[PDB]
Nucleic acid binder design. Structure first.
Ligand code: EVP
Ligand code: EVP
Ligand code: MG
Ligand code: MG
Lengths: 778, 778
DNA sequence: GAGGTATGTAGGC
DNA sequence: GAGGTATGTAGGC
DNA sequence: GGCCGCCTACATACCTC
DNA sequence: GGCCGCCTACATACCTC
């Protein structure tokens, strides 16, 4: 068994006194090695005797979905392990280490005494990924096979502090375990004075003195799992079985533990399995749902919106090419991505990919390097080390305006601003892209719609001159859906058809009877075009009718020749019995693809939402964009009023500076006093010149007060009359813009509808420019 | 054979038309895959037929040092391959692919026809590492075993452009191959207008259109190696044999190719092996010498000083902990490290390590995490992802002053400033650290001296009040070396002894005759203390006298018990015959270590230098520090005079601003004209407030001219009388400092000697503070 | 007297 | 009517 | 996310005649 | 510096009675 340092005096007569430390990873392995190799000067703490160490190798395989429970009709319920379940390395290694067998029920004391270890202790990072997923899977495995071990306290975990607050002059921390508990303590505290807060997002984050202090009290922080009667149904719901049983379980939200329950947990270290599944596992499931399911407003997940915000910040100053690993490091540093860089780099590569049938029809990045062709389905991309990306600055700036970004709700990580909670683009991305992802109860599949039907719908909704504007609003009222929405034909030489309530994409083929070669030039929408030939070479009877398959397709195009038997050409027609929707050759070559859509997204609040059609998603996305435009115009009006009054005061001071002559006043106090005496308005120029994320009410409440720094901070060069004339012209331009904004707020359909129209035209032009340049705008 | 995609139609009757593409890495593999899978629309270019692909897996093993050439006395010179040479994976894979046997000499045409490929083509990055090292090793292998293959043009390479300059409106580049050629072309060019310069520091840097254009002319850029009569001695010198034979070969410098030779190379693609060894291999050897051998001024290699400069820039704003991989990415991005991050992260970890016997006695970083203990010799450090570092801000700022860093010579990469060419600290790091590195002809071994003898020497050199000042200067004159230099005793409980001309470090042991257990508590200076017990468990007779060895040592301390045979205690004394320098037990347990020093460093110019003693290194380091102090004081004097005159002009304008009243002047032109009329001095305040990297002559030549921006850029708040009084006091302080500087330049030993003394005291205090806090200054 | 074997360091492929 | 087998996507371990 | 072949020198061990 | 086991759902194939 690899990554297993055997504990001495284990497996013998003293085996009942030995514990096995199951680590979720190698960082936990290193922490355990340090703690157990403390050795001398720490006799109370454990050493490698009576303490074995084993790694779980990340998450483990869910055995609830592997067991079959067949042939229980013989009077006994026998459970048969899957061959994939039998051949797993980590589970069989754990079974070998413990010396346990599946056939035996560990009822009496002797059966447990047969074990090679007294108990198994799990050490995982104090986070959702590991405390609720890895530990949850391990607990489910043990409950599924040997419930008596959990009942008799064979399974336990070592609990580590997530957050430590140190008060100055005191060496003991508060070691809080959950974010909610720490927040409650902080709000209970009068102030955070002389308090240093440290977050341990992983076991390896602990320091040498910290791990020494932990292992000094290693007899503590060890909690035994207990099995209740209600735990069976919870284990069945969360792991294994039908997905729907957990769907209705994951649409509610995590119920926090009562104070009495937490007090019982900490007083005596006996964690019920039901409570663990209710809290930690459910929290992990909800987080994974919010992490792997896109938000319908921006059509992109937390990872991809985080990447987009990081790219916007990184490439704003200069659009120079950046290596994928460097950009991922920048995103993790600035956007507070605390998971890793393998998945982040993979997500960046996927976001920057662009080929026929790729997931992203309008990528947010332009990629320099080899990002993979349609033939490998994006799997042939090069390493992130030697691959560069750039921000599609014009497409993003026309699709995600910065002024909109200023007014979006934002996610705050540890009190610091991070990527926005959601973006509200001028056009719905959730309808314009492809995707097929499972996530802990819900599957997400989306097929992109044409960028002619969506444009028509949005323009008819916004433009009052559109003849279908009133009809479209009535459709919004009563869900008529008068205008059509159709799958995108871009980069697809086949043809889409609709039968019943389903769409099918067909590849095209050429038959040369005299040459007896079948030429296929376009395959279904998202087939990898290389796994396709493997599928057609593995169909037993399909391969019998043919002799050779050669792939002459270059990049971006498909051209495959099939040499078949001379007498089979008619026989195939007799073999497959073509229907009205697919031909005999299409049936033979699997050229038809039924496209299914699972329109499951996450709400802006954080829940799950399911749409029956793409019209519903569009109708849900419309009001958010309307309200964003309206509030953006209102904020622009307010800030422009403030800027006009500030600039008028500035010009007045520039005019009167000769008369005032503040060169003979003591300091800023006297100068501010005399400026207030002369009637100059007090206002904080920092907020006026840059409101940033300032709402209307706070903008007003902060601009009503302030200092006279605007007057004091202006340089001598601004006193020249040319600068004053430029300032006056700027005031005229700003007041004209203010009048235009006031006109915009009174527009007939809704405020800012015309601005939405020009934005739509600009983003359409940018998208066309991208399409006709292979998404290489240079 | 792994990483080998067999070419079709190879190994048969058409094998003579097939070529094998030997790639130094997987990025080259990806480039070759793209080029060969271009396929359609590129019929002239090659495809996977007639073109095999194989990876070299980085550098290969040098077979010149593995062959033995034994038993040639039988009338024939038979060469015997080493078992390590036989068992190498990559070389045997290449041999299998080609179908080459070692016994046969490929004289006639039939023997070459027996080969499975027509020729072997090497593709490597156009840089010193790969074109001169990997290709050089491959050429040496082929020349050593089958010279007739090189003679008959079996070995060839594909050459790629290092630098491409594109002129606007023209699609063809200039594709320059060497830095010298590109520099000559650029200086020949009148100006760099409408020219875009792209550097390809690796094959994967090429773009899709670029690789398509390259493979369109793939019949070109293929150069066959030719063997000359003079190539045998060159191959022997550069690879294999004695090191000294190349020592005198690497102390000269690379001789550039003549224009006629380069014209012959590019006319007919026939590269002589002698020219390749003379240019590319020698350049690689010189670069590796400069890369792996520290500079005696700062005692750190190019990578290490690059890391130091990157850390100084990164942690200057905030000393917050940074992950090792993040810091390595920052260093690579800002200091232009174009090799990787594996070696960079390893170097960062080694630089931040601190334990008894570690290489760095005074690390430049304080490490948060597990950097490894003395037991594994630093090999037990954790992964760079979960390990943090901080800059030892006070130690660095007292040891590498910033004002010194302003005046150092700097390395410019592609016209952009990078880490300094060398640091010259207040105390010689080359004398105060450990190290043992081979580098292409020279070995570097250094044992740190005590930080009491070095301090005494430097203080006696600098302080004129020291009673040995004149004696030390006379010693400098005639190399007496009156004062002693001894190895450091810190973190070493043993004792150093000197015999003849060599120093020996001894571990200490305690003998308990009644207990019959030998307890060793301190081992030699740099033994890993775990490989030590492996060495003592592998000595056949040394293990016979003993029964058990147990390691009770914790971190930072050594405590090992040896249980030996009851009657062996006296027999060991009879077995080993103790000498006057080592005892019988010390001989038995290998507790004596002779410390050897190979004082080989790199000159600031770029050569190699060898010192016979540490006194020579100290005497070489002293004048550089003296001159830096003198020039720093000169620059301070000049810039302080400039700041005095600028501030006096500023105060005069602030006083007269009421009378001037520039508020009625049209623009900056008239304002500057009237200021010049009033007698205000013109000078560029940007250089005055921050000369940054500016010499005396350029500082003067730029300060004599300038604009009046200093007057125009000052804010209104500065016109208050308190600001004017503060400015006047600042002028008084700066003039007093100027007088003190003028006094400093007239100091008796040399200018700035006293400043050197205070610097020495400050760095000694900071070092002591680190020493007594386990290098954890917090 | 016998050497050729294996190790080991930092900066790189 | 027979189900259990294998695959496959993106974000994570 | 760990792990593994190589170069370069030079000294020091062991091993075998 | 590449490469490899897992979770999550769901539809669609094949395979076998
Ligand atoms: C060895 O050390 C540990 C490894 C792991 C697993 C892991 C486990 C594996 C395994 C591979 C991996 C690997 O995943 C790979 O990442 C790749 C990243 O690029 C993308 C393109 O492709 C991904 C592979 O699809 C995936 O397989 C690790 C990445 O980060 C992890 O957490 C993964 O192959 C065999 O078992 C967990 C640990 O404890 C927490 C460890 O200590
Ligand atoms: C697989 O892909 C390639 C690999 C390579 C080699 C390499 C080769 C190896 C091998 C390992 C390695 C590995 O070195 C390892 O790095 C580690 C980095 O952390 C430090 C602590 O420890 C280092 C190991 O001491 C070293 O062994 C690569 C790192 O960068 C390289 O260049 C190395 O084990 C077997 O053969 C070259 C290529 O073409 C250019 C490749 O395509
Ligand atoms: Mg985690
Ligand atoms: Mg290179």
């Amino acid at each position: 068994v690899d990554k297993y340092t055997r504990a001495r005096n284990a497996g013998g007569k003293r085996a009942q006194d030995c514990m096995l430390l199951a680590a979720e990873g190698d960082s936990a392995l290193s922490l355990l090695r340090t703690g157990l190799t403390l050795g001398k000067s720490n006799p109370s703490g454990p050493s490698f005797d009576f303490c074995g160490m084993i790694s779980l190798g990340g998450v483990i395989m869910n055995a609830c979905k592997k067991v079959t429970n067949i042939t229980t009709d013989s009077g006994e319920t026998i459970m048969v392990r899957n061959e994939q379940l039998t051949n797993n390395k980590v589970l069989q290694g754990i079974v070998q280490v413990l010396g346990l067998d599946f056939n035996c029920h560990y009822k009496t004391q002797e059966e447990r005494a047969k074990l090679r270890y007294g108990c198994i202790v799990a050490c995982v990072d104090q986070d959702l990924d590991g405390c609720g997923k890895i530990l949850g899977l391990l607990l489910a495995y043990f409950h599924l096979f040997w419930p008596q071990l959990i009942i008799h306290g064979f399974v336990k975990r070592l609990l580590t502090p997530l957050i430590r607050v140190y008060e100055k002059g005191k060496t003991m921390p508060v070691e809080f375990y959950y974010e909610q508990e720490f927040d409650a303590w902080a709000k209970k505290q009068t102030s955070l004075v002389n308090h240093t807060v440290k977050y341990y997002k992983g076991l390896a984050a602990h320091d040498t003195h910290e791990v020494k202090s932990m292992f000094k009290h290693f007899d503590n922080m060890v909690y035994t799992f207990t099995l209740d009667d209600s735990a069976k149904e919870l284990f069945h719901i969360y792991f294994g079985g039908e997905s729907e049983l957990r769907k209705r379980e994951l649409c509610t939200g995590v119920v926090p533990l009562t104070e009495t329950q937490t007090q019982s947990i900490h007083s005596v270290r006996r964690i019920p399995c039901s409570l663990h599944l209710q809290v930690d596992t459910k929290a992990y499931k909800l987080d994974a749902i919010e992490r792997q399911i896109p938000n319908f407003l921006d059509g992109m997940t937390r990872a991809r919106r985080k990447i987009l915000a990081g790219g916007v910040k990184c490439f704003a100053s200069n659009n120079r090419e950046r290596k994928v690993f460097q950009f991922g490091g920048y995103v993790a540093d600035h956007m507070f991505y605390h998971h890793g860089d393998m998945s982040l780099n993979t997500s960046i590569i996927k976001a920057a990919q662009y080929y026929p049938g790729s997931s992203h029809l309008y990528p947010v990045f332009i990629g320099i390097g080899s990002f993979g062709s349609r033939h490998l389905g994006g799997k042939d991309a090069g390493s992130p080390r030697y691959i560069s990306v750039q921000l599609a600055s014009e497409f993003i700036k026309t699709m995600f305006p910065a002024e909109d970004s200023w007014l979006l709700p934002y996610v705050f990580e540890d009190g610091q601003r991070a990527e926005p909670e959601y973006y509200v683009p001028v056009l719905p991305l959730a309808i314009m892209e492809y995707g097929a992802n499972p996530s802990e109860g819900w599957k997400y599949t989306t097929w992109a719609r044409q960028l002619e039907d969506i444009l028509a719908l949005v323009r008819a909704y916004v433009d009052k001159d559109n003849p279908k504007h009133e009809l479209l609003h009535y459709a919004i009222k009563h869900k008529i859906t008068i205008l059509p929405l159709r799958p995108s034909n871009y980069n697809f030489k086949g043809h889409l058809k609709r039968f019943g309530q389903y769409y099918y994409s067909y590849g095209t083929y050429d038959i040369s009877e005299q040459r007896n070669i079948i030429t296929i030039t376009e395959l279904p929408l998202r087939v990898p075009t290389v796994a396709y030939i493997e599928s057609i070479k593995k169909s037993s009877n399909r391969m019998t009718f043919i002799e050779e398959i050669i792939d002459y397709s270059s990049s971006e195009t498909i051209e495959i020749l099939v040499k078949l038997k001379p007498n089979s050409l008619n026989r195939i027609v007799e073999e497959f019995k073509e229907t009205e929707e697919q031909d005999s050759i299409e049936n033979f070559l699997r050229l038809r693809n039924c496209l299914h859509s699972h329109l499951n997204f996450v709400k802006p609040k954080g829940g799950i939402i399911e749409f029956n059609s793409y019209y519903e998603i569009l109708y849900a996305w419309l009001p958010y964009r309307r309200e964003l435009y309206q509030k953006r115009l209102m904020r622009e009006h307010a800030v422009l009023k403030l800027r006009i009054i500030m600039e008028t005061a500035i010009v007045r001071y520039i005019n009167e500076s000769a008369e005032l002559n503040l060169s003979h006043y003591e300091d800023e106090k006297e100068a501010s006093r005399i400026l207030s005496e002369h009637g100059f308005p007090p206002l904080n120029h920092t907020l006026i010149i840059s409101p940033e994320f300032a709402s209307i009410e706070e903008l007003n409440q902060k601009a009503l007060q302030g200092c006279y720094t605007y007057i004091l901070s202006l340089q001598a060069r601004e006193l020249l009359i040319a600068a004053k004339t430029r300032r006056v012209e700027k005031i005229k331009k700003m007041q004209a813009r203010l009048d235009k904004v006031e006109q915009l707020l009174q527009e007939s359909p809704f405020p800012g509808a015309s601005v939405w129209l020009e934005e739509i035209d600009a983003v359409e032009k940018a998208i066309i420019k991208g399409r006709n340049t292979q998404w290489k705008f240079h």
